[PDB]
């Protein structure tokens, strides 16, 4: 089984995630590490102790890393309608997961300095603030690191910006520091995870699994697609599970390994994650961007784990 | 006929443009203006009036514009090995065209102030500065001018860098002005003029017009393909023409309305040309960016156009 | 006498800058160029043909230059409580002096095309837009001039920012063509202007003069001062004239040789004019910024002009 | 005594700062961090240690920090001609004082959650990677740290650049962290470390004292000197020392609150500090930056501190 190590800001998309993560026989959850995000660190890390609770995960800790981007400052933007926990569904008076008493930085610093080199695969699904003070703190790291397979940017689309993907808007030096690095990246982007759509067919599909956890995420996603895309007339789609999807079977989507850096500086482009795809491309790259998903596959993969997960 | 001002740098793209352009009856002439590009001012200069006596175009100023872009240097980067005057041909002792004594940038204030409202299509080919400069040394032309036809840009694409354009990245500035006034703007980037390939099944085709124009347009596409596009195994394809097609007829190729606007100051992103391609799209967009082209009524349009100018 | 030409946006500033031009022997006011600022255009144009008025200017060519700066957009930041024309000051029903039938920037380009070279100095004492137009329009100026005296600017101070003045924060990239021509610059900046200040003593010597002129720059000056710097307590200060006075006695003022350049794209610093005075100097420096200012010879300078003006 | 952290990059400047820290009675030194700078962060750390030794420190952890700055790429620029271990001093075969097991970012999280509330003071003298390390990772401490006294910046000065100083160009990103978090921030700046003179006087007298350490110091700073500053005809500066002699006693410099701010992304400005001393100052200032210096009451501090130290 292929050891990682999952930091994301739990929202549907890093709730079905970890799910897949556990559920499927092939990863090796190692830990749960939280950052900043849409919402406060806590808002967030609660909801991962939920989902950890639902998902009925132990023997994985869970740390809080975090609180505040690098540099920028965070936009709240706080407004949730009909939202108490996470969506519809209210925390349980106490959490059966308990926090690990150690700052994320520190946990991630642990553990890869802790097992065998190239063992730990990093999932950042989230703003890169965790990971890349890690690397800022303990340089040893990036060379025992497997490698780093995140969600987020996007070469031709984006949602934060007309050029931007938010988990690298939030916080673009993070993101800058860590492409920067001499270890080897993995980006699922937009053009990516737009692609890992929830259609009806899905919703039924998964439905039929008929668990708690199931119906957990069903019942959020539908209350945030509700939201933000159910604004138009078009399904809802998850991304961060696109991550952990990819480390399990590369043949999942198709990539290509193009340079790929971010713009810090830049009145209209600031967050955006630059490739340069032109003519004759550097035969040596550490960096590689998602093109194609295989749908079927992706959504296979998710069914089988929550099948397996059962109902804890 | 449709009315417009032809402004370019001179090199085959923007020869062709001037063939079609001439040669087309639903096109009508009313100047060819001159912007500093790759090459300085006079060398394009020349460029334009050598194919102006080769198309035997009479009765149709050429004027000199900008000599430098409005705010960055110019990197002259020349270094054209076999070159003499445009490509392999050499410069007529004297030239059949004589140069207008107006600067560029008042020739096109002058003729827009003179003619009804409405009535005249900008169609820049080359950098922005020479439009720029009349925009802001005479507002009213804005509100006069039909619409604007650019070749330059690309949403998706580049090639002064890995999302910018030559045209764009040139004046970045210029370009800015441009496409932030009132009027229209349509933007033939590199994502169109990309799929304008010259197959040897086209170059036979405009052989076989025969003529010196025709021969003239090889020679030297052939010429400057070897140089550029050549270094790879893949045909060369005419740019500037595009933008001259579209207002022929607006069914050669495909247009989205999205904005646009020029990045300024970004250290990787300086030049590009931003299009907000999100979710809601806005009800009123002066913009629009090309995206596919009608291959064979593009290239039916060259070929018909070569074939009525004949041998002057 | 010294021949100049003024470019200003008429505030009382620019009005005692008008003042001073034309009661002294010393000066020769070939023009009145208009540039739009923290006013529109027409505004300061119908601003400096009041002065004009006022102070009996006759033969002087008035133009209207730029209504938009080069690139970036205006904050139109009106607001002006008791303000009708200029100040407490009413427009009379008709304008004494009329305004010439071309644009600033042409008038310009026409009068150094047309006077022997190195005759005519240039002041401007607003935007830099319309200088930066002439530059482009005709390089063959640049080297025609005498020099550029400019009331803008700061090294060490500044107001519009913590580091950025006015009259170059308005318009960046105007400043910065105009910084980096082959041209003599000398900047007169807030370090400068700062010191001439509006003492009470200052005050009834120019009360003393007595003149319909006099009383009017000084019921503007406090209407203005009110608004502004009599916020705090301390007195006004006048700067465009500064400029002037320069042209007229090199010796009002200290100067230093050193590099400025214009900053245009920092996200503080944008429109600071960036002054090198680290250890050392480059042996030819086309610019230096004032430093120290003479009190008293300046003064002297305005009485002296307000005093030859007398009652039209 | 006053508790402080000496975060630095031994150069002879910390060097004085830590000989001042160690001698002076009304200074309690807590630790010595070591940051990179202008040499690798290992050599500086080796440097650390040989004043420690030199200085006879004990008691006193010394840990080894950041080896990069948080985004910007090092310019190690190493060409030190003459140079062996610091200055012409070599290295001894082993050193007295040992590395503390953790990295400096912890130790200092560690002292502050460990000691009560405003107890400590932080006393950066190099770039400022390790303090903004500790900020994002524990904000505890923002509140607990009395205040923070560093020595960078410059607000009409500059040396790495014309307007930027090293310590904060080094790490622009690093120091805007620093200076926009609700601490209470003392700038001790280029505008004030320059008043800071050794003058032949100063040298006869620290000469005079005749202690290991004194000569240490002298032969050092003379040898540095001599590459720098002696390329010209002045004498060398000190500066480091004057954050420390400011927690001594606040009267050895003049200061003033004032708002300052980090450029970040400017062409030319990139690293300035920032400071608005624009006519109206705001009531309440975290931030303020030094003036003018007690020059007497400085260097009388240093010798009495050397004095103190005597021969270890
Ligand atoms: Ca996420
Ligand atoms: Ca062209
Ligand atoms: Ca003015
Ligand atoms: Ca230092």
């Not at 097992?115 to 890349?132: D, F, Q, S, Y």
């Not at 957990?216 to 809802?236: A, N, P």
């Not at 500086?265 to 961007?289: E, H, I, S, W």
């Amino acid at each position: 089984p292929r050891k990682i190590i999952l930091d994301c800001d739990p929202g549907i998309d890093d709730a079905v995630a970890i799910f897949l993560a556990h559920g499927n026989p092939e990863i090796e959850l190692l830990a749960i590490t939280t950052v900043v995000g849409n919402q406060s660190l806590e808002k967030v890390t609660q909801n991962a102790r939920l989902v950890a609770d639902v998902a009925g995960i132990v023997g994985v800790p869970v740390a809080a890393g975090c609180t505040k981007p690098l540099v920028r400052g965070v936009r709240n933007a706080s407004h949730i309608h009909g939202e108490t926990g996470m969506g519809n569904v209210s925390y349980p008076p106490e959490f059966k997961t308990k926090l690990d008493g150690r700052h994320a930085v520190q946990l991630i610093i642990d553990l890869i300095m802790s097992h065998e080199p190239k063992t730990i695969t990093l999932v950042p699904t989230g703003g890169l603030t965790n990971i890349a003070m890690a690397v800022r703190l303990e340089p040893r790291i990036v060379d025992r690191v497997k490698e780093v397979v995140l969600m987020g940017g996007g070469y031709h689309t984006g949602n934060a910006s007309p050029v931007a993907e938010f988990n690298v808007f939030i916080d673009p030096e993070a993101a800058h520091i860590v492409f920067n690095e001499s270890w080897n990246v993995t980006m699922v982007g937009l053009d990516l995870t737009h692609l890992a759509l929830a259609t009806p067919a899905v919703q039924k599909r998964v439905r039929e699994v008929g668990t708690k956890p199931a119906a957990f995420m069903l019942q959020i996603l539908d209350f945030y697609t509700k939201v933000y895309e159910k604004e138009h007339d078009t399904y809802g789609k998850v991304h961060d599970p696109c991550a952990v999807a990819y480390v399990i079977d590369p043949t999942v989507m198709t990539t290509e390994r193009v340079p790929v850096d971010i713009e810090l500086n830049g009145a209209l482009t600031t967050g955006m994650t630059v490739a340069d795809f032109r003519y004759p491309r550097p035969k040596n790259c550490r960096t590689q961007v998602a093109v194609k998903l295989d749908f079927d596959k992706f959504w296979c993969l998710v069914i089988d784990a929550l099948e397996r997960i059962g109902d804890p």
